């Protein structure tokens, strides 16, 4: 299991002060949001089980994200300075961080990475005690964060508060977070030539998002020949995916779709059944 | 809960 926060800060010179958006996830379930462009910005719930928290939870999260809005304004100014960039251009800082939970209920792995204009900028290393800077400007940040002991702060959070509250959320949302929804599956067939047809393997309504959809021909994986779409949200917190191969007419019986998902008791093997 | 306080880059 995991917890992640995703932050986006966007400058917009001439059209207001920088905008700050935060979203939080447990596994693939979004549970909170904050957007500084609201009239009176507040942290809001995005899954029902987080509403077991009291009003103080929402006020405190709102204080933190309001402060982040101001701090990222300063970060945007600092980075413009590092790169000698005009005040007239728009720029974006992104950050994603959080914890992966181990079998003993303690930290398995911690994560913290930031980006500038969609490119790697600085990352906390897996030892949670050192940084990887992507360029010369990020080495300015690195020296500042080394002096300020940011890595110690993040290590404590990732080993402590992060795992403590991830476990709390998993227990409070156990009935939805800790039950996998298996995919509903089928295979479709459509001619594309006198001599070729598409076989498409569908996986619908599954949770969590992690899944393996593979076509085999005579039991051999067809990875390089398989079109896989990006896993996509259904809108009801479950996911959808398909995988397609173009095959010679008359060979369809040689092809099997294999589905692996946490919700399935055993992996599925599917065939086209006209 | 998020990290309680962010540093400036």
């Amino acid at each position: 299991h995991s917890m992640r926060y995703f932050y986006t800060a966007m400058s917009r010179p001439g059209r207001g002060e920088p905008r700050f958006i935060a979203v939080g996830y447990v596994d693939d379930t979004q549970f909170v949001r904050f957007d500084s462009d609201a009239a009176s910005p507040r942290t809001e719930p995005r899954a029902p089980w987080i509403e077991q928290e009291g009003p103080e939870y929402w006020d405190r999260n709102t204080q933190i994200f309001k402060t982040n809005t101001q701090t990222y304004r300063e970060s945007l100014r600092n980075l413009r300075g590092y790169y000698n960039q005009s005040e007239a251009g728009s720029h974006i800082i992104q950050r994603m961080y959080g914890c992966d939970l181990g079998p003993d209920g303690r930290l398995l792995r911690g994560h913290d990475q930031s980006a500038y204009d969609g490119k790697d900028y600085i990352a906390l290393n897996e030892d949670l005690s050192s940084w990887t800077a992507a360029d010369t400007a990020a080495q300015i940040t690195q020296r500042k964060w080394e002096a300020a002991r940011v890595a110690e702060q993040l290590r404590a959070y990732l080993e402590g508060l992060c795992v403590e509250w991830l476990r709390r959320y998993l227990e409070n949302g156990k009935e939805t977070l800790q039950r996998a929804d298996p995919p509903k599956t089928h295979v479709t067939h459509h001619p594309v030539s006198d001599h070729e047809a598409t076989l498409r393997c569908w996986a619908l309504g599954f949770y969590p998002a992690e899944i393996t959809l593979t076509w085999q021909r005579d039991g051999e994986d067809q990875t390089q020949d398989t079109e896989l779409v990006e896993t996509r949200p259904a809108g009801d917190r479950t996911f959808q995916k398909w995988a397609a191969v173009v095959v010679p007419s008359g060979e369809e019986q040689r092809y099997t779709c294999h589905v692996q998902h946490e919700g399935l008791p055993k992996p599925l093997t599917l065939r086209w059944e006209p | 809960v998020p990290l309680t306080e962010d540093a400036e880059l």
């Epitope: 204080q63 300020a148 | 400036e8």
Partner: T-cell receptor, first 112, second 113 residues
Amino acid sequence: QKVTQAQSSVSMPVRKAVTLNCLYETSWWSYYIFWYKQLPSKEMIFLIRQGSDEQNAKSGRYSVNFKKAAKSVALTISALQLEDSAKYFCALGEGGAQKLVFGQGTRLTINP
Amino acid sequence: GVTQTPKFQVLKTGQSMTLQCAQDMNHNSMYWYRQDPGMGLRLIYYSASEGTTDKGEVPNGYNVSRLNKREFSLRLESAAPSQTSVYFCASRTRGGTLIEQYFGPGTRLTVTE
């Protein structure tokens, strides 16, 4: 008191150690404790910090025995010097705002 | 570090006075506290950055102004004897672990009738 120091005045010989007690209450999930000392000039001097997510703090002759479940954060000063005489304050900073809540302090007199 | 002026002040009841604070550490978070005799410090106002004062969070008898990144002022609008106190400004960095507040030298303020 939301932050309570148990002693109002303590005396101890040079070269010994002293422990100054501090208990606090909070419902915040993230906080810090700070120990300061105040000189006769009224100047306030930072000594040592204790984070709610960190192990027992140590800084030179200062250490904090952080008993988190008991919300106890006693300061111990080792190898006492005459220059350690001062009024010592325990302060709680909660969450992101860090609006410090102070104990009423303990006067420490180091005796030659 | 953090500077404050004046270090000492006497006022008559009803007089107004502006206390000045400045810090050169590139901090955003700044604070005003007061310390009565024999007591700890009590917060008057926390200024997280430049911006407009939240007057609903300013205690009666005071005006607070964050003038720029470095400078922070506390005014006693009509001094009362109950406002006799040592007024401390403080500032701190945000982020990392070294978030302890740095105090100015204080303004020792006595109000007499």
